[PDB]
Design a protein around this ligand. Structure first.
Ligand SMILES: Nc1nc2c(ncn2[C@H]2C[C@H](O)[C@@H](COP(=O)(O)OP(=O)(O)OP(=O)(O)O)O2)c(=O)[nH]1
Ligand SMILES: [Ca+2]
Ligand SMILES: [Mg+2]
Length: 430
DNA sequence: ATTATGACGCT
DNA sequence: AGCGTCAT
């Protein structure tokens, strides 16, 4: 009843760039604009591996993780842009720099949490309070929400998609009580007005389009963002959660798309997120642990408390390369040459990071995979990172991994290495 | 032969 | 610390 917390205390948005690496390449090369196109890494093996796909290309069935040769079967006119290669490996600097462009615009509106190269959470609670005091009880025009969908609407008592969007928005706005400055629905709506402005600023100042979700917490904002892509934003109200969750597969909620989600489905004999409401908090804790159980109990009612962390910069800077099948490294000189390549890219990125962001990494993490292990990482070892020097970094990494070499022979490396990974961590202000 | 990252939880 | 999970 009156004491039952409803998780409506915050306004949280999630801004995700549409087909991000494709947009970066389309900005640079106008011949790729408004075309089926994809971004690929490498080329010799099966035409390269697709990592981003324009919405035009998605209509043909092209997806991430597909080999370009196979994508070309589905979409013979598909256009491809390749990720840059430097020191023998994929170099993602262009996309990281474009990400910084977007993140700096977003930071003008509110403190953001960088969730990935192309996605940021926004805590809009304070900005909404401010804009509400400016509004002075003035209603919110549909003209201020030109790309907003209201999830669950229209309902009750119409052919095209834009008309449907507008019908739902008008139902939502007509149900609004603008007199109450603590109405959660009003707060979400003002949040959506702000996100429209943020998205317009991103597109004006970068050329990039994005989608967004607006709700009361990060999980619902992320889910909302996915409902109407591309180039649209979606408001998920607290009241929309029972219907939305009643047919929502558990795997669609962030953090439940892997083994934990599969165990929720198997142990409880359910399919949809809304079915979780029928279990007590103790029951869920008994199956999934104290933390997961409390989180599931609240999540399935639309409640989640994870804060938007004030963090615009990545906490680690890392360099990784796979050496698949027959390209696995089998000589000491090979291992040393590739460690040096990785370390040179890392030194370049670290030196730029130190100049831009007034910080220095203090720990170097070295990870490898050996042929045969089905795990991502076979071994992970840290050492001190005391100087930004690639030869020192690569010598140190070799020192911490050299004992994995089973080969009695000094020159050979056995079993061959199928992955190398260097990561700088534990930053301190400088 | 899916590749290149990145965040966070567990013990 | 080192490993595992999850995301994409
Ligand atoms: N190197 C590499 N980059 C990846 C991989 N998966 C995704 N990315 C990059 C390329 C994407 O453009 C970018 C952002 O990923 P998203 O999941 O947000 O997808 P994207 O923005 O492409 O499409 P969207 O409109 O959000 O569905 O991250 C991967 O496996 N490897
Ligand atoms: Ca995206
Ligand atoms: Mg994203």
């Amino acid at each position: 009843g009156p004491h039952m917390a409803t998780g409506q205390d915050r306004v949280v948005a999630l801004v995700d760039m549409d087909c991000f690496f494709v947009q970066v390449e389309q900005r640079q090369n106008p011949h790729l604009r408004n075309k089926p196109c994809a971004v690929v890494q490498y080329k010799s093996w099966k035409g390269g591996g697709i990592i981003a796909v324009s919405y035009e290309a998605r209509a043909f069935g092209v997806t991430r993780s597909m080999w370009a040769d196979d994508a070309k079967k589905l979409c013979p006119d598909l256009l491809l842009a390749q990720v840059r290669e430097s020191r023998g490996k994929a170099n993602l600097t262009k996309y990281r720099e474009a990400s910084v462009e977007v993140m700096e615009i977003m930071s003008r509106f509110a403190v953001i949490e960088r969730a990935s190269i192309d996605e940021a959470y926004v805590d809009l609670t304070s900005a909404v309070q401010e804009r509400l005091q400016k509004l002075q009880g003035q209603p919110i025009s549909a003209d201020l929400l030109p790309s907003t969908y209201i999830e669950g609407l229209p309902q009750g008592p119409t052919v095209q998609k834009e008309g449907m969007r507008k019908q739902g928005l008008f139902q939502w706005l007509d149900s609004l009580q603008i007199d109450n400055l603590t109405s959660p629905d009003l707060q979400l709506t003002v949040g959506a007005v702000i996100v429209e402005e943020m998205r317009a600023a991103i597109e004006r100042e970068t050329g990039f389009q994005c989608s967004a979700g607006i709700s009361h917490n990060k999980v619902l904002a992320k889910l909302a963002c996915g409902l109407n892509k591309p180039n649209r934003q979606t408001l998920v109200s607290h009241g929309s959660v029972p219907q939305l969750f009643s047919q929502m597969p558990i795997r669609k909620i962030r953090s439940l798309g892997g083994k934990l989600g599969a165990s929720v489905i198997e142990i409880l004999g359910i399919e949809y997120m809304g079915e979780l409401t029928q279990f007590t908090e103790s029951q869920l804790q008994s199956h999934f642990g104290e933390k997961n159980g409390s989180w599931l109990y609240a999540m399935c009612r639309g409640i989640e408390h994870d804060p938007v962390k004030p963090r615009q910069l990545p906490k680690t800077i890392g360099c990784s390369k796979n050496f698949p099948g027959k390209t696995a490294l089998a000589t000491r000189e090979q291992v040393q040459w590739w460690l040096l390549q990785l370390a040179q890219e890392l030194e370049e990125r670290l030196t730029k990071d130190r100049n831009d962001n007034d910080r220095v990494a203090t720990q170097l993490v070295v990870s490898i995979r050996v042929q045969g292990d089905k795990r991502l990482s076979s071994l992970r070892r840290c050492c001190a990172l005391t100087r930004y020097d690639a030869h020192k970094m690569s010598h140190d990494a070799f020192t911490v991994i050299k004992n994995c070499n089973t080969s009695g022979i000094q020159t050979e490396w056995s079993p061959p290495l199928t992955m190398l990974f260097l990561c700088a961590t534990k930053f301190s202000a400088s």
